[PDB]
Amino acid sequence: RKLILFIVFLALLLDNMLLTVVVPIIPSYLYDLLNENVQVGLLFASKATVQLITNPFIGLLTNRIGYPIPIFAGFCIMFVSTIMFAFSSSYAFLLIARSLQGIGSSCSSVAGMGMLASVYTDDEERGNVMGIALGGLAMGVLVGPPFGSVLYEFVGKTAPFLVLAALVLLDGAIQLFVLQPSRVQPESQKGTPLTTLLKDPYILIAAGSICFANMGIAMLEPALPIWMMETMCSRKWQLGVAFLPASISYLIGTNIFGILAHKMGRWLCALLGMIIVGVSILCIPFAKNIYGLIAPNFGVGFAIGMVDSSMMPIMGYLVDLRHVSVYGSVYAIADVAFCMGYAIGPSAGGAIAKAIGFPWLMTIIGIIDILFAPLCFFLRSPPAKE
Ligand SMILES: COc1cc2c(cc1OC)[C@H]1CC(=O)[C@H](CC(C)C)CN1CC2
Numbered sequence: 001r002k003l004i005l006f007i008v009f010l011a012l013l014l015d016n017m018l019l020t021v022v023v024p025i026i027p028s029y030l031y032d033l034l035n036e037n038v039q040v041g042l043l044f045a046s047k048a049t050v051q052l053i054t055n056p057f058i059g060l061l062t063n064r065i066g067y068p069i070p071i072f073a074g075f076c077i078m079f080v081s082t083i084m085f086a087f088s089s090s091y092a093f094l095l096i097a098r099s100l101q102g103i104g105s106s107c108s109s110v111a112g113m114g115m116l117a118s119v120y121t122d123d124e125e126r127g128n129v130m131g132i133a134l135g136g137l138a139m140g141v142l143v144g145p146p147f148g149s150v151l152y153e154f155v156g157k158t159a160p161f162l163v164l165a166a167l168v169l170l171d172g173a174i175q176l177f178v179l180q181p182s183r184v185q186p187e188s189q190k191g192t193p194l195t196t197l198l199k200d201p202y203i204l205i206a207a208g209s210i211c212f213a214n215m216g217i218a219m220l221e222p223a224l225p226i227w228m229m230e231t232m233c234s235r236k237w238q239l240g241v242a243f244l245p246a247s248i249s250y251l252i253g254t255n256i257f258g259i260l261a262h263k264m265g266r267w268l269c270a271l272l273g274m275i276i277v278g279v280s281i282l283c284i285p286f287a288k289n290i291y292g293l294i295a296p297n298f299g300v301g302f303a304i305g306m307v308d309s310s311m312m313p314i315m316g317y318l319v320d321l322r323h324v325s326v327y328g329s330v331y332a333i334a335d336v337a338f339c340m341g342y343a344i345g346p347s348a349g350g351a352i353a354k355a356i357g358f359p360w361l362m363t364i365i366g367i368i369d370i371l372f373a374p375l376c377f378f379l380r381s382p383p384a385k386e
């Protein structure tokens with residue numbers, strides 16, 4: 001059980017490190033405080049809209065053949081994408097590699113959380129373990145951009161991707177020796193169909209709380225001033241620094257609240273997280289400086305980690321309670337909810353910021369987050385099966 005948790009942690013860590021190592025490199029491929037960028041928006045939306053599409057199939061797939069094979073396929077796709085990045089001399093193949101990374105993320109984020117849920121059947125154990133696993137995502141996002149900047153400038157253009165490929169090969173060897181995916185291992189019972197789970201209001205509440213928490217940051221990041229050419233020409237260090245606050249805060253929030261959400265109550269933890277997300281992004285329109293975004297980014301990361309640590313275990317809890325205890329489809333739903341913000345926001349936020357304005361966009365997103373929060377009260381005591 002320890003080694004499965006370590007494998008999931010490492011998979012998410014390297015996934016989100018490959019996700020973000022490209023940040024210092026992106027400006028070289030395309031060359032008010034917040035202005036939306038189409039070409040950055042496409043880089044954000046490609047992986048997310050391929051992972052969202054892939055997610056339901058992985059939920060259905062893990063029922064047929066079990067979890068280890070999709071996890072190993074996620075590793076394979078991650079390695080192939082990492083190799084393709086190191087030799088992508090064009091923007092369109094950057095998009096292609098992002099789509100491949102989306103497929104791999106779908107695999108290793110649906111089947112890894114499903115295996116965590118199935119291996120840790122205790123509710124409190126599952127909460128703690130999933131908090132650690134999401135801390136892995138936070139660590140990957142933390143490490144990515146600075147590693148990319150250091151190796152890109154002081155070693156060479158291809159060095160960060162080759163080193164990351166070596167790390168991914170180590171991850172694959174660990175998965176080979178632990179999971180041994182050579183044999184098809186179907187689930188012990190047929191899971192509840194996806195259409196029936198989507199008709200459950202409480203799973204909808206949890207998925208909505210997961211989804212709306214990510215909307216504001218999903219619409220903020222493609223609009224950051226760091227993509228402007230003055231950063232590439234003079235201010236390069238901001239490309240590495242800009243994602244540190246949210247990563248640190250998300251890491252701390254997930255680590256503490258994986259433990260704390262069970263004692264406090266995951267409904268109350270998610271409600272407070274949603275309120276804090278709504279309030280912290282309402283403070284973004286106040287910023288007239290890039291340094292003004294540091295505190296709202298820290299608050300947003302902390303509260304998003306809080307919401308995730310509250311809501312990821314209850315996805316397994318709700319199927320253990322009201323449905324058949326098979327975890328692939330509920331985490332397909334949860335990952336669809338997570339990816340929907342980064343899939344839609346880079347386009348919808350740009351259109352809305354053109355229509356009414358970006359400060360009003362962030363204001364409305366925060367207001368929506370605040371208004372959604374009372375719905376978490378329904379998760380306090382859901383009824384069981386008949
Ligand atoms: C360069 O591309 C991307 C960069 C980034 C993200 C997504 C991207 O592409 C889809 C997300 C990842 C998270 O979940 C992050 C959530 C927590 C770290 C708060 C937010 N940001 C980090 C940077």
